[PDB]
Amino acid sequence: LTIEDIHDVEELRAVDEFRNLLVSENLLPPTLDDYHIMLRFLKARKFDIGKTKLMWSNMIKWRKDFGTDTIFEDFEFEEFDEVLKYYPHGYHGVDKEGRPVYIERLGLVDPAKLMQVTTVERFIRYHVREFEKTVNIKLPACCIAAKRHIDSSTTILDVQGVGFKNFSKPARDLIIQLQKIDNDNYPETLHRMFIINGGSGFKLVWATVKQFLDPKTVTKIHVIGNKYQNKLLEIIDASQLPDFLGGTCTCADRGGCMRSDKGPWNDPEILKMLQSGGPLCRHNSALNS
Ligand SMILES: CCCCCCCC/C=C\CCCCCCCC(=O)O[C@H](COC(=O)CCCCCCCCCCCCCCC)COP(=O)(O)O
Ligand SMILES: [Cl-]
Ligand code: NI
Ligand code: NI
């Protein structure tokens, strides 16, 4: 199967020069020997080979110390159904460019009930296990469905009713911790973010959070008030957008859009193409031979 994957000659050179540096210092596990993973790290440090190597070796040590390589089999997150009741979030369909759409209903987060049913450390380990599923299953499924290389998501954060007066220091610190793990270990995986239903109460929440965010991440974020539905329908087809966000989707047979995990990673023919299929990238295939 032929997937649209344009490589720039200048990027092909830089990534191979980075790969040769990693091999010569035994910093390249075969699991991470992928043109596109290395390209994301190089982009995160503006193709500075020395800063990217330091970022890379920090990530290798992090995967070792965290237990990231074995998290699917090791981490049984038994409180998942209770957590999801007090923090509604999920992937739901694809945007018009084939990227997965990730939604969080932050207006419906119950922080007190959430700390009754999990811990911050367990929630973060669940975040890492879901990220591993996103980069190994969900993004490659989107590559197949669109016949195009995809490795980043469109995020919608619904912040209805969220105001600065109820924006707590533990809420801030979780955002910091989640972003630190994402920026260190999953770089360049956010394409864009739409923050919707922001009230006048939200202006100081966004002010204070931007002080802690990677400034490249800030440039990918759009904060919208109550009139958001047409902006989401411009970039996401109505069939892929839940009806509560202005689309047609109800996922009624699966108990609703925030629980269905709807997307091409649920299709058995696409998942067979991942397990059976030869590499999604021609440069990896040519390095192998
Ligand atoms: C009602 C209680 C507080 C509600 C939440 C506060 C409002 C948050 C406002 C702004 C957040 C802006 C963050 C921008 C950076 C996120 C970048 C990003 O890509 O992350 C995406 C998801 O977005 C986030 O990570 C957003 C941050 C999540 C955390 C939100 C805070 C939850 C608060 C719970 C409090 C628990 C502790 C309470 C103890 C009493 C996923 O990436 P991808 O699409 O690539 O898979
Ligand atoms: Cl589906
Ligand atoms: Ni749905
Ligand atoms: Ni490629």
UniProtKB/Swiss-Prot annotation:
Localization per record: Golgi apparatus membrane; Cell membrane
Cellular component GO terms, alphabetical: Golgi membrane; plasma membrane
UniProt domain CRAL-TRIO: residue ranges: 79-253
Alphabetical UniProt keywords: Cell membrane, Coiled coil, Golgi apparatus, Membrane, Protein transport, Transport
GO biological process: protein transport
Domain of life where this protein originates: Eukaryota
Predominant localisation class: Golgi
Similarity section: Belongs to the SFH family.
Primary role: Required for transport of secretory proteins from the Golgi complex. Catalyzes the transfer of phosphatidylinositol and phosphatidylcholine between membranes in vitro.
Record-given protein name: Phosphatidylinositol/phosphatidylcholine transfer protein SFH5
Source organism of the structure: Arabidopsis thaliana (Mouse-ear cress)
Source taxonomy: Eukaryota, Viridiplantae, Streptophyta, Embryophyta, Tracheophyta
Gene label: SFH5
